[PDB]
Design a protein around this nucleic acid. Structure first.
Ligand SMILES: [K+]
Ligand SMILES: [K+]
Ligand SMILES: [K+]
Ligand SMILES: [K+]
Ligand SMILES: [K+]
Ligand SMILES: [K+]
Ligand SMILES: [K+]
Ligand SMILES: [K+]
Ligand SMILES: [K+]
Ligand SMILES: [K+]
Ligand SMILES: [K+]
Ligand SMILES: [K+]
Ligand SMILES: [K+]
Ligand SMILES: [K+]
Ligand SMILES: [Mg+2]
Ligand SMILES: [Mg+2]
Ligand SMILES: [Mg+2]
Ligand SMILES: [Mg+2]
Ligand SMILES: [Mg+2]
Ligand SMILES: [Mg+2]
Ligand SMILES: [Mg+2]
Ligand SMILES: [Mg+2]
Ligand SMILES: [Mg+2]
Ligand SMILES: [Mg+2]
Ligand SMILES: [Mg+2]
Ligand SMILES: [Mg+2]
Ligand SMILES: [Mg+2]
Ligand SMILES: [Mg+2]
Ligand SMILES: [Mg+2]
Ligand SMILES: [Mg+2]
Ligand SMILES: [Mg+2]
Ligand SMILES: [Mg+2]
Ligand SMILES: [Mg+2]
Ligand SMILES: [Mg+2]
Ligand SMILES: [Mg+2]
Ligand SMILES: [Mg+2]
Ligand SMILES: [Mg+2]
Ligand SMILES: [Mg+2]
Ligand SMILES: [Mg+2]
Ligand SMILES: [Mg+2]
Ligand SMILES: [Mg+2]
Ligand SMILES: [Mg+2]
Ligand SMILES: [Mg+2]
Lengths: 154, 79, 205, 129, 121
RNA sequence: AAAAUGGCAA
RNA sequence: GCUAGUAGGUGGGGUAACGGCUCACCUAGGCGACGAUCCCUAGCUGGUCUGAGAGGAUGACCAGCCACACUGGAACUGAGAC
RNA sequence: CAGAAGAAGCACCGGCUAACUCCGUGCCAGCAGCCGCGGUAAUACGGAGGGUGCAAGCGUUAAUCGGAAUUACUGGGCGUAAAGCGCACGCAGGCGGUUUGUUAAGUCAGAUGUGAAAUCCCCGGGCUCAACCUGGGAACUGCAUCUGAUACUGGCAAGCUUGA
RNA sequence: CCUGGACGAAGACUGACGCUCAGGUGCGAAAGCGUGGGGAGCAAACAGGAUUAGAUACCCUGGUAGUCCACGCCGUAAACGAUGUCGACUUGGAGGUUGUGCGCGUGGCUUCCGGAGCUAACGCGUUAAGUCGACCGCCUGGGGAGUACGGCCGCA
RNA sequence: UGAUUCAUGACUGGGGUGAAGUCGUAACAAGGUAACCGUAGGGGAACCUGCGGUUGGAUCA
């Protein structure tokens, strides 16, 4: 499983004594063959936060129906303020995507894609929008089964 | 054939002349909605046959006046 | 229009041997290949995504000795050419007369091959070509000039080439000191160490 | 007032699928029946039937593959407020060909693929996926 | 907005006014120093920043920052100005080009010499 | 019942 | 809101040629919220730059068209020029 | 023919953004695109060593588009962030239930004419390569006409009853 | 006394006669303005008494315009559901109010709660802020400013 | 003789910026008289008061 640290942020809560600082870590893990999950971890120390995120990511993996390292069709994903568009690309195109989307796509095993993030580019919401787009992608085989047709007919 | 336009007479006040409104349905270049556009032509009416609200066929001709280069072919519909 | 500085620093920055020396001796003996150049070289800073992309592009450039403007033009050509842009790009760099002369073993290094080409010691299809960037077509014959055949450097380079792995797409005859570019190298023929996708992504940044 | 009966039909399917209704019914029309035939032919709906003469009602039987609606998206394209027509060369592809575009051509209502085979353009009624 | 509304009134683009109007879309302009003085920056900065009031060839009168350490500018000095506001000096939208016309290069500069009109040692 | 005020800093 | 040669008609003159082009007489028209009139700015195009595209910006060089030739005005000669 | 001879600079190194330390200075002098930096241990000023990026150039300024889905046709919004007219009637305008026939305006298909050449793009050819030059094609998304198609939209005619 | 609208029942009738609406027109709280009345209570202003450091206030005692009527003007309000109008569609529960058929139905309007869905969140949730269609109005960083200037309107 | 545009003009209106100035304390908590909207009158100033309106008011033991 490939693991990528997307973002580390210092957050704060106020108490009578003063401010209490903690760290958050957004991570993604993937098998490079259409399995990908994201993890969000919080702790007083950065390494602890990363470890918690990685552990969550490993148990939150979902399956994506990739076609030869590319998407099946153009997909739109939305979470909170983040709206993402992703489209299949030719071999050698590479990952043409923004940073947060890039990590998800790389670990998922997408080698070629054209993407654009609209609205908020907040990493936590972008990761969720991206994974949402991928999960709702339809293979030709699944469309054929739902429509009661053969893939050739589709 | 001969190229002709069909339009509604909007004025017949001039002597031997009428103003005819030609309607064209055109797709808007950006928005893509089909919009009605109007072109008004001064037309020669030798017999002063046409009346306001009539539907007429007109053909292009040589200049007959400053603003007239079209002539009446027939009155398709009376008002 | 050419890098004339120390060669091993480039390899040290990349962290891999760029074959900027003959290979008569190991790079480790010549320099501390592992350590990056300079005072703070021993420290290994975390590299950003941009950093990773930049370093890959610089590595490929340093291997073939191409400056940015020419390398950018290669990228643009590779993108225009049909098929895989990254594969097209590597094919263009391989097609350079300079590279072909080194791969045929006429030159010990690409820089040595460059001087040979520049100094009119190389003929393509029986015509003298002194342009390093010249693109060699399939079935072209690259040969040393009769005058330059006697040079000691060329003979030494041929011996070194025997030690190195032989390119499948090139047929070379020693003594005759002529070679034929049979076909454009496949991606499989080239090293898998290079990640061309990073370069393509970088130029789309 | 009611100014787009086709959009109403598409919405009834969309809402019915969302509400996991077994079937949806509406006032019938020749155009609606034509669209229903394409939907049935492409396997988006199980069946359709028309009942009554003075006021015919079209009933469409919806389908769910695994407790999930087969029609994941259905959207009006050409609409009264903005009509969309395309040449055969510019005929739209839905979900990279996995979906269908319903097209009204001079030879009748058909999928984009069928229209492209017949080398005909027409009005893009709706996208279905 | 509906298509019908856009047909009646199309989307309108912004004015996009220049921040360097005195240049009048020229890379530089020549001017004569009417006054050379120092001004304090706005908070949270403290300094005595060197500026000149300049009357340009186009007739506009503007304030221009004199960058680098030390200068020879006086009233009646002919200088070349370029675009570039000074964040902490309100109303200063231009920089004096060091080492052009009457303005001399900064003395004893070894780095970023081209930015201060200093010839190679 | 009355019950005003407290430079910007980091 | 704009317009009295103004808009149209009849006849005469004029032009290489149709024509308010000009003139006499007659009618009262004509234009305009699908922006007339007025104000400001501007040579137009093939193209060029940018952009995934749709757009946006631009019209130097090259080629097509137009306009101008100290400023205002005028004709003459000529197949053709004001 | 003779000889390494005659031929390297510019910006940058706090984050964005590839590249770090020492010394000097001490809210000064100065830097600065933005966020900001400087009040005695400054990777942010100035110099030096080292490094990064470019290279016969390199920076700066001006200017256009991009990123900006930040005028949103493609492709945005309006309970509280900017945004529903105080409410309503209503002309122009936009849009409109269902059936048949007819028309063929829109629409669609094909053909013809035109859409200068250059340019752009593709496949080639020529200058040692390239830039550059050049052959043929494609394209010029348009406009007009002719001949067809008739589902949808429009027109016309006759209806229908579900809206009114 | 004159008069507008809504809703229900069962039939009959007309036969798309519809929806929206720039400009236009009408209506439009309170205060205010004009003319003529009226004037108990209340009460801007005003006066005095307190309170207070001061007290042009809050509190007290008084008190004029005004509040009322006729007619004309003004045309604005957090004129708010801060939610444009019309139509279709999409799980429920408890109420209120008003019809109607045979305890069980079936209509109109309305209050609370909540499901999916939606939403930045708060929340909305068949009376949508859900899912769609038609048409209109409006927005484009904060100040400067709903101000200046010009126009139109108004007695002001 | 008009229109329009630009420049300028004693003085004057409001706006902005700048010292740790002077006078108060109007708002934010029930901000110590809930706030705010329209309007009217008054007052060194923030504001106060009347009339109607809104909740984008706290409290309820
Ligand atoms: K400071
Ligand atoms: K005339
Ligand atoms: K005449
Ligand atoms: K253009
Ligand atoms: K002239
Ligand atoms: K002649
Ligand atoms: K839009
Ligand atoms: K028809
Ligand atoms: K109307
Ligand atoms: K009284
Ligand atoms: K409206
Ligand atoms: K004046
Ligand atoms: K108060
Ligand atoms: K008040
Ligand atoms: Mg060069
Ligand atoms: Mg000009
Ligand atoms: Mg874009
Ligand atoms: Mg002559
Ligand atoms: Mg870095
Ligand atoms: Mg120090
Ligand atoms: Mg720029
Ligand atoms: Mg844009
Ligand atoms: Mg927005
Ligand atoms: Mg507010
Ligand atoms: Mg608001
Ligand atoms: Mg309202
Ligand atoms: Mg037709
Ligand atoms: Mg051409
Ligand atoms: Mg019809
Ligand atoms: Mg009143
Ligand atoms: Mg009164
Ligand atoms: Mg009283
Ligand atoms: Mg009192
Ligand atoms: Mg208002
Ligand atoms: Mg009210
Ligand atoms: Mg409002
Ligand atoms: Mg209405
Ligand atoms: Mg609720
Ligand atoms: Mg005002
Ligand atoms: Mg207070
Ligand atoms: Mg208070
Ligand atoms: Mg309050
Ligand atoms: Mg008071």
């Amino acid at each position: 499983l490939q693991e990528k640290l997307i973002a580390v942020n210092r957050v704060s809560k106020t108490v009578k004594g003063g401010r209490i600082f903690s760290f958050t870590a957004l991570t993604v893990v993937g098998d490079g063959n259409g399995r990908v999950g994201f993890g969000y971890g919080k702790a007083r120390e950065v390494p602890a936060a990363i470890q918690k995120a990685m552990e969550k990511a490993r148990r939150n993996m979902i399956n994506v129906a990739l076609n030869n390292g590319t998407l099946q069709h153009p997909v739109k994903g939305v979470h909170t303020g983040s709206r993402v568009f992703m489209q299949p690309a030719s071999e050698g195109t590479g990952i043409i995507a923004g940073g947060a989307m890039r990590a998800v796509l790389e670990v998922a095993g997408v080698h070629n894609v054209l993407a654009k993030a609209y609205g908020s580019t907040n990493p936590i919401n972008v990761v969720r929008a991206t994974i949402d787009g991928l999960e709702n992608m339809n293979s030709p085989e699944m469309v054929a089964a739902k429509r009661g047709k053969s893939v050739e007919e589709i | 054939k001969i190229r002709t336009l069909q339009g509604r007479v909007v004025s017949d006040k001039m002597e031997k002349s009428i103003v005819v409104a030609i309607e064209r349905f055109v797709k808007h270049p950006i928005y893509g909605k089909f919009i009605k556009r109007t072109t008004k032509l001064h037309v020669h009416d030798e017999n002063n046959e046409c009346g306001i609200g009539d539907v007429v066929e007109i053909r292009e001709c040589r200049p007959l006046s400053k603003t007239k280069s079209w002539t009446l072919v027939r009155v398709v519909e009376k008002a | 229009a050419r890098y004339l500085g120390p060669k091993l620093k480039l390899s040290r920055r990349e962290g891999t041997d760029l074959f900027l020396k003959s290979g008569v001796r190991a790079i480790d003996t010549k320099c501390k290949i592992e350590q990056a150049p300079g005072q703070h070289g021993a420290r290994k800073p975390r590299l950003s995504d941009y950093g990773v992309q930049l370093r890959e592009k610089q590595k490929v450039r340093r291997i073939y000795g191409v400056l940015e403007r020419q390398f950018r033009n290669y990228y643009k050509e590779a993108a225009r050419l049909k098929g895989n842009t990254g594969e097209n790009l590597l094919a263009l760099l391989e097609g350079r007369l300079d590279n072909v002369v080194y791969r045929m073993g006429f030159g010990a290094t690409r820089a040595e091959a460059r001087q040979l080409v520049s100094h009119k010691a190389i003929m393509v299809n029986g015509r003298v070509v002194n342009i390093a960037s010249y693109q060699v077509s399939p079935n072209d014959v690259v040969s040393i000039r009769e005058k330059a055949k006697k040079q000691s450097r060329v003979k030494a380079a041929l011996e070194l080439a025997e030690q190195r792995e032989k390119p499948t797409w090139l047929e070379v005859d020693a003594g005759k000191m002529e070679g034929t570019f049979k076909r454009k190298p496949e991606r499989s023929d080239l090293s898998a160490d290079i990640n061309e996708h990073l370069i393509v992504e970088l130029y789309s940044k | 007032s009611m100014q787009d009966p086709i959009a109403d039909m598409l919405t009834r399917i969309r809402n019915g699928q969302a509400a996991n209704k077994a079937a949806v019914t509406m006032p019938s029309s020749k155009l609606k029946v034509a669209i229903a035939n394409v939907l049935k032919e492409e396997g988006f709906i199980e069946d359709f039937k028309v009942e009554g003469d003075t006021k015919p009602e079209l009933e469409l039987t919806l389908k769910y593959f695994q407790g999930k609606a087969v029609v994941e998206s259905i959207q009006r394209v050409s609409r009264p407020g903005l009509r969309i027509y395309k040449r055969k060369d510019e005929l739209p592809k839905v979900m990279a060909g996995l979906g269908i575009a319903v097209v009204s051509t001079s030879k009748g209502v058909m999928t984009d693929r069928a229209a492209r085979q017949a080398g005909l353009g027409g009005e893009i009624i709706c996208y279905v996926a | 907005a509906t298509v019908n509304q856009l047909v009646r009134k199309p989307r309108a683009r912004k004015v996009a006014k220049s921040n360097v109007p005195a240049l009048e879309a020229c890379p530089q302009k020549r001017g004569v120093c009417t006054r050379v003085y120092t001004t304090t920056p706005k908070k949270p900065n403290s300094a005595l920043r060197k500026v000149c009031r300049v009357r340009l060839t186009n007739g506009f009168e503007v304030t221009s920052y004199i960058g680098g350490e030390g200068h020879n500018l006086q009233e009646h000095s002919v200088i070349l100005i370029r675009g570039g506001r000074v964040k902490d000096l309100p109303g200063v939208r231009y920089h004096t080009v060091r080492g052009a016309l009457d303005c001399s290069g900064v003395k004893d500069r070894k780095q970023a010499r081209s930015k201060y009109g200093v010839k190679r040692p």
